[PDB]
């Protein structure tokens, strides 16, 4: 029988049981409502299939030789120019874009694999644009330049920076422009923790964590012990308070 394989993407192939006299497989898909066809030859899935859209813009599946990764791609009719491109990569997190009428991308949505998201927008032919990073209940927003992007949160005379280098490195800043209230904040690279200082004793510390989440813990009143147990922020309002 012939076989049906998992994609990444939530896509799915079915691959012919046996090749023809060239050694090649037959391939098909239907996404969406799209019937999609190509020929491999290898016999597990991988290769290339293609269709049109029923506006005639040429549609092209690549599913790489290990099954590992898939490119979505749209082009226009004569499938010259990008429309759009999804790749989904082997952690099943994605990238989709946008092009314009030159092939320049406009968009880019980069979904990680826990959900949360990049969203950069309204691309200029530099790479810069708007940003915002969509998180489990709350989003930061910023923008983009082809050195990093920076995201702000405002909170009374303090302002908070998460910057995202072009590189993918993360760092935060803080600052206060009034100089009475003593308070400043050192960034530690080692464990992506912001530590706030109030008249040269810690407050708290802003951890920014790998799993795209932010938690804030309190130190005692000597300024040199954490206290409690650090708590998850789960909403704009929270990271506010813990600039006041």
Same mark, same amino acid.
């Given at each position: 029988?012939?076989?049906?394989?998992?994609?990444?993407?939530?896509?799915?192939?079915?691959?012919?049981?046996?090749?023809?006299?060239?050694?090649?497989?037959?391939?098909?898909?239907?996404?969406?409502?799209?019937?999609?066809?190509?020929?491999?030859?290898?016999?597990?899935?991988?290769?290339?299939?293609?269709?049109?859209?029923?506006?005639?813009?040429?549609?092209?599946?690549?599913?790489?030789?290990?099954?590992?990764?898939?490119?979505?791609?749209?082009?226009? =009719?004569?499938? $010259? /120019? !990008?429309?759009?491109?999804?790749?989904?990569? *082997?952690? &099943?997190?994605?990238?989709?874009?946008?092009? %314009?009428?030159?092939?320049?991308?406009?968009?880019?949505?980069?979904?990680?694999?826990?959900?949360?998201?990049?969203?950069?927008?309204?691309?200029?032919?530099?790479?810069?644009?708007?940003?915002?990073?969509?998180?489990?209940?709350?989003?930061?927003?910023?923008?983009?330049?082809?050195?990093?992007?920076?995201?702000?949160?405002?909170?009374?005379?303090?302002?908070?920076?998460?910057?995202?280098?072009?590189?993918?490195?993360?760092?935060?800043?803080?600052?206060?422009?009034?100089?009475?209230?003593?308070?400043?904040?050192?960034?530690? =690279?080692?464990? $992506? /923790? !912001?530590?706030?200082?109030?008249?040269?004793? *810690?407050? &708290?510390?802003?951890?920014?964590?790998?799993? %795209?989440?932010?938690?804030?813990?309190?130190?005692?009143?000597?300024?040199?012990?954490?206290?409690?147990?650090?708590?998850?922020?789960?909403?704009?309002?929270?990271?506010?308070?813990?600039?006041?």
């Amino acid at each position: 029988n012939s076989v049906s394989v998992d994609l990444p993407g939530s896509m799915k192939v079915l691959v012919s049981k046996s090749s023809n006299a060239d050694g090649k497989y037959d391939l098909i898909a239907t996404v969406d409502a799209l019937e999609l066809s190509g020929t491999s030859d290898k016999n597990n899935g991988s290769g290339v299939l293609e269709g049109v859209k029923a506006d005639a813009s040429k549609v092209k599946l690549t599913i790489s030789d290990d099954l590992g990764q898939t490119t979505l791609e749209v082009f226009k =009719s004569d499938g $010259s /120019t !990008l429309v759009s491109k999804k790749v989904t990569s *082997k952690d &099943k997190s994605s990238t989709e874009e946008k092009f %314009n009428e030159k092939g320049e991308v406009s968009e880019k949505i980069i979904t990680r694999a826990d959900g949360t998201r990049l969203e950069y927008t309204g691309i200029k032919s530099d790479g810069s644009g708007k940003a915002k990073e969509v998180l489990k209940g709350y989003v930061l927003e910023g923008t983009l330049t082809a050195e990093k992007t920076t995201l702000v949160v405002k909170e009374g005379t303090v302002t908070l920076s998460k910057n995202i280098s072009k590189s993918g490195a993360v760092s935060v800043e803080l600052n206060d422009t009034d100089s009475s209230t003593k308070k400043t904040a050192a960034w530690n =690279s080692g464990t $992506s /923790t !912001l530590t706030i200082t109030v008249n040269s004793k *810690k407050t &708290k510390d802003l951890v920014f964590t790998s799993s %795209n989440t932010i938690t804030v813990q309190q130190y005692d009143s000597n300024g040199t012990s954490l206290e409690g147990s650090a708590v998850e922020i789960t909403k704009l309002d929270e990271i506010k308070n813990a600039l006041k």
